[PDB]
Each structure stands twice: as structure tokens, then as C-alpha cells.
């Protein structure tokens, strides 16, 4: 096999610790390309995006060249990556200690010294979660690739060009790519970025940034958390039709709705991130419905106090009675003693009935206010969540789409 003598001649005087620059002040182009095989996860508890990506790296090495006419027409040789020099292009913004690739595949070399490497890797990059519109939110975080041990005076990172145009995107495979099930890839731009604060001689002067605009599918959160909580918070508006009696169960219903909301808070606390920069939208809605439930409990206590008043306990003033009953546009003396006792208990019952009617009027008055408050708050919060959509362009200041 001619590959044996070809490899023995190529690697006979090869030093993998040396940059392949031909002369002094020679900068080697290191073209990069990404291929997102499948989006594994985005764990917002530690704000880490776990992805599976194949990284295409192409460069030129003047050492590994051969005249194919001298050999038997061989023009493409696979060499293990451990025996060859590498640009050490690593993911800088990792959440773990894993910087390099996960497999170290063989690298292909051509006649002209062209070198093509395709290692796969599993990257747990950092991803600052914007919790403003959780769970209807969209996340804009990126993978940053840079040469760990070289500066801009030695290497020159740039995006690879295939047919004469720069591949400024992630280029997922249209067929062999399964959806995450909770995230949709809306925009996948890519760009070379300079820090412009450090000098060119610094290794961190240049980088290649692959963004990933990901929109969360809120289906599971709607089905299991949002809609049941909405139904529970809608139940508390029914309390104004329950009678204000011993068996009315008004305060029981309201406080048990509050207890259900507390259990929902316990459920929610295991899912929401702990960034503390902003309150999650689901958290805002939960605080709002808890405040509404507290106000409704207070109103129920007030209504029960009003409807259970007695002439023996309070005095019904003429002002209150007028206000709440006119402004609603929306050896023989034993028989005498029995008669007078019946008359006085009838009068006390009549005043109690007046208090009950006042309670009914205030119930009907406050029910509409509570219903409007709850409906407006819920609709406003969820319409704000729904209107939160991915921007049309990947960058607001650019007209390009960065889409093949």
C-alpha cells in the first residue's frame, strides 16, 4: 500500500507543536463552519445550552504536500488528528471544563496541503436566560469559537465560503434533523467579531460567533400549569353568587382557591429560573391572581360582616340605607305579651332583612369590578406574552437574513 510510504515520508520530520507558517509574518487562514446535528437541551436552572455540533475546520499546511504523479495517483490521505498540528479552535464560553472537541476524528489532507477536519462535539455553552416573558420567551444566546493558544498575528479565523459566498449561518440539514420538541430554531446567524478593546497581539482579539435564536414551545406549560391555574383563578369570581349564610361557604371557597394557588406556586417554583434580573411573566400572573384572591377574601369577609349584622350589634343609619337601596340603577295579658314579643322579633328580623339586602347589593356591585379586573389582567398579561415574538431580522441594524 502506497499510503504506508506516503505517511512515513510525510510524518518523518513533522513536529505537531509548530505552527505551519511558511515564513515570518505569515498568517494561516482557518475557515470555520458549523453543523448543528441536533439541539439537545437548554437547562435554564444553570443557564446552559447543550448542543451536538459537527465543526468543519479547513486550513493549509505547507509541510503535508506531495506530487501525486510520483505516487500511484493517491490524492487524499486520512491522518489521525493526534499526529498533526491543530489550530486549537475551542469554545470559549463553556459552562464546564470541556473546551476541545469530543471525538478527535481523522483529518483529510490533499495534494496542495489543504487540510479538512470534521470533528463532532457536544458543547454545554453558556446561555443567559431572558426571563422577562417566561415561558413564552425567546432566547438569544450563542457559541463563541476562538483560538485558545494563538492570536490574530498568527491565525486568521473567518467563515468558510463554499461557492464564492460566505456561509454566514449554521446550516442544519433540512432532512436529517429532528426538532427539539420544546425549542424552534428561528434565526441562526453567524459572524466574525472583534473585541476592539484588546490589541491585535492578544489571543482574544478575534472570535467566531454562531447565534441561536430559539423560541420555546409553550404547549406543555399551557396544558399542565397555565390553563389549570387560569381555571382556578376564574373559580374565585363565582363566590359573589353564594349566599351570605352559615352554609354559604363563601370564605371556604375563596381560601381553598388561594390554597390551590399556593400549591400551584409550589409547582411553579421547581421550573422557573433564578436569574433575579426580572420577574417571570408566569410569576407576575401568579402574584396578580394571589393578590386578586386576597382582595376577594377581604371582600367576602366584609360582605359576611355586613349581611350578618343585627340591631342588637350595630345601628343601620339612614344614609347607608338610602345609598344602598335607592342607588341601584344596575289572666289575659299573656296574649298581649306574646303579641308584643312577636312584633319586636318581626321588627328585628325586618332590619336583618334590610342588612341582607344591602349585602346582596354590595355583592352585585363588587362582582362586576372583580370580574373585569381578573379578566383584564389575565388577557393583558397573556396578550403581552403572545405578542412577544422573534424580531424579523437577526440583527436590528442589518437588512440581511443570514439564511441560505
Amino acid at each position: 500500500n502506497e499510503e504506508g510510504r506516503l505517511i512515513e515520508k510525510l510524518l518523518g520530520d513533522y513536529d505537531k507543536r509548530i505552527i505551519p507558517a511558511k515564513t515570518l509574518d505569515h498568517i494561516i487562514d482557518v475557515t470555520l463552519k458549523l453543523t448543528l446535528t441536533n439541539l439537545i437541551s437548554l437547562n435554564e436552572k444553570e443557564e446552559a445550552l447543550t448542543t451536538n455540533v459537527w465543526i468543519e475546520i479547513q486550513w493549509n499546511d505547507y509541510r503535508l504536500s506531495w506530487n501525486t504523479s510520483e505516487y500511484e495517483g493517491i490524492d487524499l490521505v486520512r491522518i489521525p488528528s493526534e499526529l498533526l498540528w491543530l489550530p486549537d479552535v475551542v469554545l470559549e464560553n463553556n459552562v464546564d471544563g470541556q473546551f476541545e472537541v469530543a471525538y478527535y476524528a481523522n483529518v483529510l489532507v490533499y495534494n496542495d496541503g489543504s487540510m479538512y477536519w470534521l470533528p463532532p462535539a457536544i458543547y454545554r455553552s453558556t446561555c443567559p436566560i431572558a426571563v422577562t416573558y417566561f415561558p413564552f420567551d425567546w432566547q438569544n444566546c450563542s457559541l463563541v469559537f476562538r483560538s485558545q493558544t494563538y492570536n490574530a498575528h498568527e491565525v486568521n479565523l473567518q467563515l468558510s465560503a463554499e461557492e464564492g459566498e460566505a456561509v454566514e449561518w449554521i446550516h442544519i440539514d433540512p432532512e436529517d434533523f429532528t426538532e427539539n420538541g420544546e425549542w424552534t430554531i428561528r434565526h441562526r446567524p453567524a459572524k466574525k467579531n472583534y473585541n476592539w478593546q484588546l490589541t491585535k497581539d492578544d489571543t482574544d482579539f478575534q472570535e467566531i460567533i454562531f447565534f441561536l435564536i430559539i423560541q420555546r414551545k409553550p404547549l406543555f406549560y399551557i396544558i399542565n400549569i397555565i390553563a389549570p391555574c387560569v381555571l382556578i383563578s376564574s373559580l374565585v369570581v363565582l363566590v359573589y353568587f353564594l349566599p351570605a349564610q352559615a352554609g354559604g361557604q363563601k370564605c371556604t371557597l375563596s381560601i381553598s382557591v388561594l390554597l390551590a394557588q399556593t400549591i400551584f406556586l409550589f409547582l411553579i417554583a421547581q421550573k422557573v429560573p433564578e436569574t433575579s434580573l426580572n420577574v417571570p411573566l408566569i410569576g407576575k400572573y401568579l402574584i396578580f391572581v394571589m393578590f386578586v384572591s386576597m382582595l376577594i377574601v377581604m371582600n367576602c369577609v366584609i360582605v359576611l360582616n355586613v349581611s350578618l349584622r343585627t340591631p342588637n350589634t350595630h345601628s343601620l343609619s339612614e344614609k347607608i340605607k338610602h345609598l344602598f337601596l335607592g342607588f341601584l340603577p344596575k289572666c289575659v295579658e299573656a296574649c298581649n305579651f306574646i303579641a308584643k314579643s312577636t312584633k319586636e322579633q318581626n321588627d328585628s328580623g325586618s332590619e336583618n332583612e334590610n342588612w341582607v339586602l344591602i349585602g346582596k347589593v354590595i355583592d352585585k356591585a363588587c362582582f362586576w369590578i372583580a370580574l373585569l379586573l381578573f379578566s383584564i389582567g389575565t388577557l393583558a398579561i397573556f396578550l403581552t406574552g403572545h405578542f412577544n415574538q422573534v424580531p424579523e431580522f437577526p440583527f436590528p441594524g442589518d437588512p440581511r437574513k443570514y439564511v441560505p
Partner: protein, 398 residues
Amino acid sequence: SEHETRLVANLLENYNKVIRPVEHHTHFVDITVGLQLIQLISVDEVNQIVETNVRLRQQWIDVRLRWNPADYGGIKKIRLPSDDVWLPDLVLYNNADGDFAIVHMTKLLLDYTGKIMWTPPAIFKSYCEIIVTHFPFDQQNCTMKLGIWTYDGTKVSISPESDRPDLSTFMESGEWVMKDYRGWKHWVYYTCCPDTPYLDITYHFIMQRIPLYFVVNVIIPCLLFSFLTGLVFYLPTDSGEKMTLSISVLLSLTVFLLVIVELIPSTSSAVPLIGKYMLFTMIFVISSIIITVVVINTHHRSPSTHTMPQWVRKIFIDTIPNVMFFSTMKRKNPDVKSAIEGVKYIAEHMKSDEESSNAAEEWKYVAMVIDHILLCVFMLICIIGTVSVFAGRLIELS
């Protein structure tokens, strides 16, 4: 033996692990690749990752690793470390979390003709799409895609050892049933070079989940809660617990929602049948609570505040109760004259009390008839809802 040490020293004298083991570079190595499963480690739906334990039967022919047995004391088969000979770079294309290729690197069997047989073990964390629509009665089609990474056709060609993966030593998983298991070989051509096919082997398994655990631990409590939801309409409104029962079974369902979250997978690809039934039960409880609020409100409706309309009374008094045959429904001195006036006053007060109590009793009767009707309606709704949710998949299974 000293014969075997001499044989190994002579074989590995000038061997090069990097070089592809072929006679001429225009030819290719015919590598017979088969996979034998051992145990299904785990299946995760929130990440769509299936972890399996496999052994990779890889066979090929190395022309450099041959000898005459009669020249070495009759030795025919030897064992060699895998780090000394050329190894194909078989990679799982759809790898998710595990290692992309073989990492354990156990020893391999070498014959006197050069037939390298290698059986390394591996734990494959493959990425296969999880259809959660029919959970927990779902049927997953999980695939593992093996391919030569760096090389291609006419250099390193792989072929399936058998039409199906070996499952003779496959222990029972206890949660899944292997309905079918097959392995296909795909050629993929590219327009850049039509004479360089790219070869891969996909092994697909059809796993039908055993649903007993989710039926016992999730379906039964939800069914019990749904059955008890409609029971509240038989509870009379005279008892003050009519609201208490409904809101407390609602609290019980809310507590069981924690178990549902901690047990079922949390995916947004599609709503599972468990989620559909849980949402149906929740909406059923909410509607029952609204209905019993209406019943309680129409039970305490005072005759003075509201008069009974003729139509609703007519319907609920003399037509509907007659239909329900199974129910037991009911279908000379100032002081003397002042005492006389007091007796007349208490008599007319008792008359007014009797009239008001009769009107209130009419309201109670209307509420009771409504309770019976809605009890029957809600029981029928619960039964037909459970049947409509589950019987489709139950029939599709058989």
C-alpha cells in the same frame, strides 16, 4: 508460550496502525458489521435520548496479520490488544450524550488467515424522535445509525452481518416489548461525485411501552376523581358541604397534579393522552363547580326578592319529575279586643310564614330536580369522555 511471543514479535515488527489494511489503495476493506443488544438501559422523552447496551461484531481481513501456523507450533488463533492494529472508526451519527465511537478498546481475536473479529462493548445514547401522542400506550421507533466517519465507499465499505440485530442474549427490559427489530444498509450519493457512495447502517427497534405502571399510578386516581366529581349533585344543598366536597376534590386533583408532573415526561411536541385526560378531568371539575354554584344560588333564592317564573316552574314541576320513574320524587273590653287583635296578628304572621316557606320549598324542589338531571348528565359525560379518550388507542392496539 514462547511460540506465541515470537509470533507476536514477528507480526508487530513493521506494522503501522495508521495505514488502511488493504493490498492496493484502489481496493477497499469489506467490514462485516453487526450489532447485538444486551439490555435497554433507559428511554428519556424530555431529551429524546435512548441509552442501550450493545456489542459491535466487527469483522474484516488484514493481509499483514497472517502467518503459517505450522511454522509457529500449530497456533491458529491469538488475542491482540485493539491499540496495536488498525481499527475502523465506526461512529454513531445520531449520538446525543454518549461517546461517538468505541472507547473501551478490548482485545480482539485474530486467525491465521488474517480474519480480525472484534466484539467491543458500548453504551449508545442515541437520539431518536419520540412520539408522545399516544402516551403511555405509545409505540416508539428508535434508530441507531452507524457509519464510517472519515472514509467512504470504495475505501471502507460496511455490510450488515445479518438482516436483524442479535437479541438472543437480550434480557427483558421490564418496561418495553420488542415488537420488531431490523437493520438496513443505506447508500447515499452526492452530486459533487456520483461515483463515491456513502454507506451507513441503520438499526431500528419498535418498542411498545408496558402501560401497567402509568395505568395504576396515574389513570386510576384520575378516574376515581372524575367519578367522584359528579357525585356532588346527589348531595343535598341543605347540607353545607355541597361546596366543600367539590372544592376539596379539586384540591385533591391539584395535589395529584404534582405527581403527574413528577411522573409523566414534560414535552411540548404534542399533548399526550395523559395530558388530554388530565385536562378533561380538570375542566370537568371546574364545570361541576360552576354548576353547583348555580344550584346553590337557585336553592337560596328568596321568594320576596325573586318570583318564580311560570315556564321553568311548569317544566320542573309537572313534566320532568314524571319522566324519572326510578327516582322517589314527590309528584267587650279594650284589653280583650287587644288580645283578640294580637291573636289575629300572630295567626296572619303564621299564614305569611307558611306562604313564604311553601315558595321556598318550590325553589328547593326545582334545585333538587336540577341536581338529579345534572347528576345523570355528568355521569354520562364522564363515562363517554373516558371511553372516547382511551377506547380508540385500546382498539388500535388489538
